[PDB]
Motif scaffolding. Structure first.
Motif, PDB file in Angstrom:
ATOM      1  N   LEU A  71     -46.950  16.455  21.234  1.00  0.00           N
ATOM      2  CA  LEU A  71     -47.121  15.767  19.975  1.00  0.00           C
ATOM      3  C   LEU A  71     -45.854  14.960  19.745  1.00  0.00           C
ATOM      4  O   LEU A  71     -44.766  15.523  19.596  1.00  0.00           O
ATOM      5  CB  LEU A  71     -47.292  16.771  18.827  1.00  0.00           C
ATOM      6  N   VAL A  72     -45.985  13.640  19.753  1.00  0.00           N
ATOM      7  CA  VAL A  72     -44.844  12.768  19.500  1.00  0.00           C
ATOM      8  C   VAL A  72     -44.965  12.362  18.038  1.00  0.00           C
ATOM      9  O   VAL A  72     -45.970  11.781  17.637  1.00  0.00           O
ATOM     10  CB  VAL A  72     -44.889  11.508  20.374  1.00  0.00           C
ATOM     11  N   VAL A  73     -43.953  12.682  17.239  1.00  0.00           N
ATOM     12  CA  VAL A  73     -43.987  12.347  15.825  1.00  0.00           C
ATOM     13  C   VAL A  73     -43.091  11.170  15.464  1.00  0.00           C
ATOM     14  O   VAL A  73     -41.864  11.266  15.468  1.00  0.00           O
ATOM     15  CB  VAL A  73     -43.643  13.588  14.969  1.00  0.00           C
ATOM     16  N   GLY A  74     -43.734  10.046  15.161  1.00  0.00           N
ATOM     17  CA  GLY A  74     -43.017   8.841  14.794  1.00  0.00           C
ATOM     18  C   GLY A  74     -43.775   7.619  15.277  1.00  0.00           C
ATOM     19  O   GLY A  74     -44.544   7.698  16.235  1.00  0.00           O
ATOM     20  N   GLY A  75     -43.566   6.486  14.618  1.00  0.00           N
ATOM     21  CA  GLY A  75     -44.254   5.274  15.024  1.00  0.00           C
ATOM     22  C   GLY A  75     -43.325   4.149  15.448  1.00  0.00           C
ATOM     23  O   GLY A  75     -43.798   3.056  15.783  1.00  0.00           O
ATOM     24  N   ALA A  76     -42.012   4.403  15.447  1.00  0.00           N
ATOM     25  CA  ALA A  76     -41.031   3.381  15.832  1.00  0.00           C
ATOM     26  C   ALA A  76     -41.026   3.178  17.338  1.00  0.00           C
ATOM     27  O   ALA A  76     -41.731   3.882  18.063  1.00  0.00           O
ATOM     28  CB  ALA A  76     -39.623   3.763  15.340  1.00  0.00           C
ATOM     29  N   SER A  77     -40.233   2.216  17.805  1.00  0.00           N
ATOM     30  CA  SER A  77     -40.160   1.901  19.234  1.00  0.00           C
ATOM     31  C   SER A  77     -39.893   3.138  20.082  1.00  0.00           C
ATOM     32  O   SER A  77     -40.609   3.394  21.051  1.00  0.00           O
ATOM     33  CB  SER A  77     -39.078   0.845  19.507  1.00  0.00           C
ATOM     34  N   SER A  78     -38.867   3.902  19.724  1.00  0.00           N
ATOM     35  CA  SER A  78     -38.541   5.105  20.480  1.00  0.00           C
ATOM     36  C   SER A  78     -39.758   6.008  20.692  1.00  0.00           C
ATOM     37  O   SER A  78     -39.986   6.498  21.798  1.00  0.00           O
ATOM     38  CB  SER A  78     -37.417   5.882  19.792  1.00  0.00           C
ATOM     39  N   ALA A  79     -40.555   6.207  19.649  1.00  0.00           N
ATOM     40  CA  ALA A  79     -41.740   7.056  19.772  1.00  0.00           C
ATOM     41  C   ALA A  79     -42.764   6.468  20.733  1.00  0.00           C
ATOM     42  O   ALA A  79     -43.339   7.184  21.546  1.00  0.00           O
ATOM     43  CB  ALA A  79     -42.383   7.281  18.407  1.00  0.00           C
ATOM     44  N   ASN A  80     -42.998   5.164  20.643  1.00  0.00           N
ATOM     45  CA  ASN A  80     -43.970   4.526  21.527  1.00  0.00           C
ATOM     46  C   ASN A  80     -43.483   4.530  22.979  1.00  0.00           C
ATOM     47  O   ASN A  80     -44.284   4.636  23.914  1.00  0.00           O
ATOM     48  CB  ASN A  80     -44.246   3.091  21.068  1.00  0.00           C
ATOM     49  N   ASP A  81     -42.171   4.408  23.165  1.00  0.00           N
ATOM     50  CA  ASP A  81     -41.600   4.425  24.509  1.00  0.00           C
ATOM     51  C   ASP A  81     -41.809   5.806  25.119  1.00  0.00           C
ATOM     52  O   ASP A  81     -42.194   5.933  26.282  1.00  0.00           O
ATOM     53  CB  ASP A  81     -40.095   4.125  24.478  1.00  0.00           C
ATOM     54  N   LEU A  82     -41.555   6.839  24.317  1.00  0.00           N
ATOM     55  CA  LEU A  82     -41.708   8.212  24.774  1.00  0.00           C
ATOM     56  C   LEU A  82     -43.155   8.473  25.189  1.00  0.00           C
ATOM     57  O   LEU A  82     -43.412   9.101  26.220  1.00  0.00           O
ATOM     58  CB  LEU A  82     -41.275   9.179  23.671  1.00  0.00           C
ATOM     59  N   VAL A  83     -44.094   7.978  24.385  1.00  0.00           N
ATOM     60  CA  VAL A  83     -45.518   8.133  24.673  1.00  0.00           C
ATOM     61  C   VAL A  83     -45.862   7.593  26.059  1.00  0.00           C
ATOM     62  O   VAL A  83     -46.535   8.258  26.840  1.00  0.00           O
ATOM     63  CB  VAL A  83     -46.379   7.396  23.626  1.00  0.00           C
ATOM     64  N   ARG A  84     -45.404   6.381  26.355  1.00  0.00           N
ATOM     65  CA  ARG A  84     -45.664   5.779  27.654  1.00  0.00           C
ATOM     66  C   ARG A  84     -45.030   6.585  28.789  1.00  0.00           C
ATOM     67  O   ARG A  84     -45.656   6.820  29.820  1.00  0.00           O
ATOM     68  CB  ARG A  84     -45.137   4.343  27.686  1.00  0.00           C
ATOM     69  N   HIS A  85     -43.787   7.009  28.587  1.00  0.00           N
ATOM     70  CA  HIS A  85     -43.055   7.777  29.586  1.00  0.00           C
ATOM     71  C   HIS A  85     -43.667   9.151  29.869  1.00  0.00           C
ATOM     72  O   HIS A  85     -43.535   9.666  30.975  1.00  0.00           O
ATOM     73  CB  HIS A  85     -41.605   7.925  29.133  1.00  0.00           C
ATOM     74  N   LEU A  86     -44.333   9.732  28.877  1.00  0.00           N
ATOM     75  CA  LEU A  86     -44.969  11.041  29.041  1.00  0.00           C
ATOM     76  C   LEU A  86     -46.400  10.933  29.573  1.00  0.00           C
ATOM     77  O   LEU A  86     -46.951  11.895  30.103  1.00  0.00           O
ATOM     78  CB  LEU A  86     -45.019  11.796  27.705  1.00  0.00           C
ATOM     79  N   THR A  87     -46.994   9.758  29.433  1.00  0.00           N
ATOM     80  CA  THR A  87     -48.372   9.539  29.852  1.00  0.00           C
ATOM     81  C   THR A  87     -48.708   9.931  31.294  1.00  0.00           C
ATOM     82  O   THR A  87     -49.765  10.506  31.561  1.00  0.00           O
ATOM     83  CB  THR A  87     -48.785   8.061  29.600  1.00  0.00           C
ATOM     84  N   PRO A  88     -47.820   9.627  32.247  1.00  0.00           N
ATOM     85  CA  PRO A  88     -48.152  10.003  33.623  1.00  0.00           C
ATOM     86  C   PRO A  88     -47.864  11.459  33.966  1.00  0.00           C
ATOM     87  O   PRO A  88     -48.201  11.912  35.059  1.00  0.00           O
ATOM     88  CB  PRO A  88     -47.316   9.032  34.453  1.00  0.00           C
TER      89      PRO A  88
END
Ligand SMILES: Cc1cc2nc3c(=O)[nH]c(=O)nc-3n(C[C@H](O)[C@H](O)[C@H](O)COP(=O)(O)OP(=O)(O)OC[C@H]3O[C@@H](n4cnc5c(N)ncnc54)[C@H](O)[C@@H]3O)c2cc1C
Ligand SMILES: Cc1cc2nc3c(=O)[nH]c(=O)nc-3n(C[C@H](O)[C@H](O)[C@H](O)COP(=O)(O)OP(=O)(O)OC[C@H]3O[C@@H](n4cnc5c(N)ncnc54)[C@H](O)[C@@H]3O)c2cc1C
Lengths: 442, 442
Positions: free
Chosen positions: B214-231
């Motif tokens: 669960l990534v909590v936040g909508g700023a750039s850092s949060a979206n970057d983390l989402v992509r990095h965790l996706t694979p």
């Protein structure tokens, strides 16, 4: 088995990485899997502000298991011995693979950032071939294949096993520290926790401001450390050379080998009667030991099947590559006193053509003769077994290059074998002078 | 005092370093001294495999002291929030100082390696002006000067005091984590040691392979983390957006804000009734708090003298630089949603001309008016106080550029003020699109 289809590479550092590309270029293998305990490739080029948790003082056992720093909020970290301000001791004209050059305007002896970026680029296309955060526990011949046991790095991972036709061990030889057991060292070290360090722990020189330091050793690492400590440590800096030295001035005092450490008075006795006292730090720059931390290989002790004994070198490896008893086991990166990337590449290219069958190894008896002759020329100095100081290294890679050219059939895309011409050799011969002039030293 | 001769700079990161060069370029100061707790300059660009020792969960106090990781064999390490595979979110055409370009063949959005090397090159000629491994404990106006108290980082160092005519605080603002105090978070966090993390602890993504996140936040850092965790993370990845989100597929399930954490059932309640369970990792990408950890400055609480309150921003700083009550105290690097290097240079250029007297600040009442108007335009959203999102940054840096151009007398060598023309502004305006196309995203 001669027909090799599935290969396991232990380690995703400079040596394992170039081994993968060469193997994959043979278009002859169905599987090439790299195993890496770190979360990323690059070997020691993964700079870690983290220090090893417990330095063995003394350290004479080559089978010592590397303990990673672990925590609940992070992937386990395997500390690298690279220090903060490190710049190469190898010029960009020679270091680095022959088919990936350095960007323009790169310093001749670049900072590690450049080499870390160079490795990151090199390894990027290999990521899908690497099992990251995976520690290989053991390697043993079972039936007609190699059984590599491994466990995912990460609390709770299950031990697993896979079988391959061949295994290339590229685990590196700069991890297990070598600290000679001297009288009173152990006790001296334990009485004051950070009084006895090793080069693998060096990171930042500001830690030594004001302190009186005794660097022990006369190799390149020891001299580099002395220069780095000179602007911060208290003057003078002591350096214990085996036979003493010729430099005795205000900033550097070279002295003879250590005889005994006085746990009680904290004095250090040197051969010849000289005795040092009030030494805040003693940093051993005595190098490391070779290691094959895989129970099934490490147990082998007979003269014809042993790999490791005292960790001075890896035994029974024809051309420092093929395990004589069974060439489906190989090593890349054992070379000492060489330019790492190019040398490992030379070995990888040859290793690839031999394993695909495009090249054949000479008879088992001839391989054993190659070894006997080497052992004979060592005159008992086994830690020089894998040493290829110039011109040995130039001759070696050119020898492997010419052999690789003989591979057949010819492939449309031939993974290159580096080659050192008149120009490359000249640079390698005067490497340390070119380096001395670059950093304005010596 | 108006005639400034001795200046102290707190922090030797990108901000403190460019402030040093701008000040020295005035050729009007007798002493410029940078203080830096880390062993080397470069700020957050000092990648650390070392994580913060203890994450405060929740974290709402901006005065929180940063605890460095210490050991008997190393210099204290202050962990950086940079992660392993980090690449910039600012293109080379804009980041970086206007008087130091990037080497040729540099990637538009380079890996941190490139930027760490950039900072190293930029900071080298300033090493003799920096007191390294030194932590500033307090800063207060005593008599007619500023007394800065500091202690050498390193067990046993003595607390020392030096006075200066002016002090430039460049301590950064991405150190103290901000984690909102939600119902049951604390308990839920302490139950399972690594269940709740903050973006500043992220390093290697392989730690999340197979885990539900669960990534909590909508700023750039949060979206970057989402992509990095996706694979690596188990699909789908959950992202808690304040107002919920429009993406709900197999790999990413955006959900509304968190209501409560159920310690007993380890369930996460979301606004709207939606409840999550079996979440292995909760990673707060809720940013950081501004911090002024100096007792004599942190105690100030009156409306006209306060610097810090809730850590949403630093109050009473004319143009986000000069402390209105006493302009001999300034800040560089406070800007939010800006391109860091250039923006801090734009400030440093102005700060330097003002402190040497070549430029004059407007009246104190006019400075306060500038602040009143800013506070009014904020409409209560104080965390947007230092935000200069385009075109605000463009206008701001160009405004400072044009002011510096009025300095007198003219100096033979004028430290440059970056300037963003038609071309630059264009890149800044479409920065996130250019970036998205570079990494093939959005
Ligand atoms: C202080 C220092 C400075 C140096 N400076 C230079 C220099 O300036 N120039 C130069 O050319 N060379 C330099 N070198 C040499 C360096 O050894 C080489 O550049 C290069 O890293 C060789 O790499 P490798 O793959 O053989 O070994 P390594 O880089 O050591 O990589 C071995 C890899 O295998 C992994 N591994 C080991 N055991 C296992 C296991 N059981 N399971 C899974 N993975 C395992 C490791 O974790 C690691 O990633 C330096 C070395 C040191 C120690
Ligand atoms: C995860 C992350 C990713 C980022 N990615 C980018 C990017 O791609 N591009 C970009 O342009 N910017 C990026 N940034 C922004 C970054 O803040 C700036 O590039 C740059 O570091 C600005 O630095 P500074 O000097 O203002 O702050 P910092 O780099 O934080 O430096 C402050 C320094 O002062 C020292 N210090 C603090 N308090 C004291 C004290 N009391 N005594 C002594 N020393 C002290 C610190 O130890 C530190 O070295 C990123 C930031 C983060 C957190």
């Amino acid at each position: 088995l001669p027909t090799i289809r599935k290969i396991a590479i232990i380690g995703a550092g400079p040596s394992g990485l170039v081994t993968a590309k060469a193997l994959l270029a043979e278009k002859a293998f169905d599987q090439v899997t790299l195993f890496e305990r770190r979360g990323s490739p690059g070997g020691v080029w993964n700079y870690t502000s983290t220090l090893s948790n417990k330095l063995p003082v003394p350290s004479t056992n080559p089978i010592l298991t590397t303990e990673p720093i672990v925590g609940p909020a992070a992937l386990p970290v395997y500390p690298s011995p690279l220090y903060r301000d490190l710049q190469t001791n190898t010029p960009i004209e020679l270091m680095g693979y022959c088919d990936q050059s350095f960007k323009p305007q790169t310093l001749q002896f670049p900072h590690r950032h450049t080499i870390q970026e160079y490795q990151r680029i090199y390894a990027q296309p290999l990521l899908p071939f690497i099992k990251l955060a995976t520690d290989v526990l053991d390697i043993e011949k079972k039936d007609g294949s190699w059984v590599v046991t491994y466990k995912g790095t990460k609390a709770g991972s299950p031990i697993s096993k896979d079988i391959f036709d061949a295994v290339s061990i590229c685990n590196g030889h700069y991890e297990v520290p070598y600290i000679p057991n001297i009288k009173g060292l152990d006790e001296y070290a334990k009485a004051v926790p950070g009084s006895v360090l090793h080069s693998s722990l060096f990171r930042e020189p500001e830690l030594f401001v004001g302190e009186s330091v005794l660097v022990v050793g006369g190799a390149s690492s020891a001299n580099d450390l002395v220069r780095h400590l000179t602007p911060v440590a208290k003057h003078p800096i002591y350096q214990s050379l085996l036979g003493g030295g010729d430099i005795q001035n205000e900033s550097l005092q070279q002295v003879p080998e250590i005889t005994k450490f006085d746990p009680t008075t904290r004095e250090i006795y040197l051969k010849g009667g000289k005795v040092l006292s009030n030494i805040d730090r003693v940093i051993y720059c005595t190098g490391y030991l070779y290691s094959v931390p895989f129970p099934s290989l490490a147990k082998l002790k007979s003269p014809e099947t042993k790999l490791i004994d005292d960790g001075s070198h890896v035994h029974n490896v024809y051309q420092h590559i093929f395990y004589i008893p069974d060439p489906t086991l190989a090593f890349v990166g054992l070379a000492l006193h060489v330019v790492p990337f190019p040398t490992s590449q030379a070995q990888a290219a040859f290793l690839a053509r031999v394993w695909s069958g495009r090249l054949k190894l000479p008879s088992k008896e001839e391989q054993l003769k190659w070894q006997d002759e080497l052992m004979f020329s060592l005159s008992g100095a086994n830690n020089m077994y894998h040493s290829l100081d110039y011109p040995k290294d130039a001759t070696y890679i050119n020898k492997l290059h010419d052999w690789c050219k003989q591979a057949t059939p010819v492939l449309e895309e031939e993974f290159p074998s580096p080659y050192w011409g008149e120009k490359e050799r000249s640079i390698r011969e005067n490497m340390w002078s070119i380096r001395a002039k670059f950093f304005g030293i010596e």
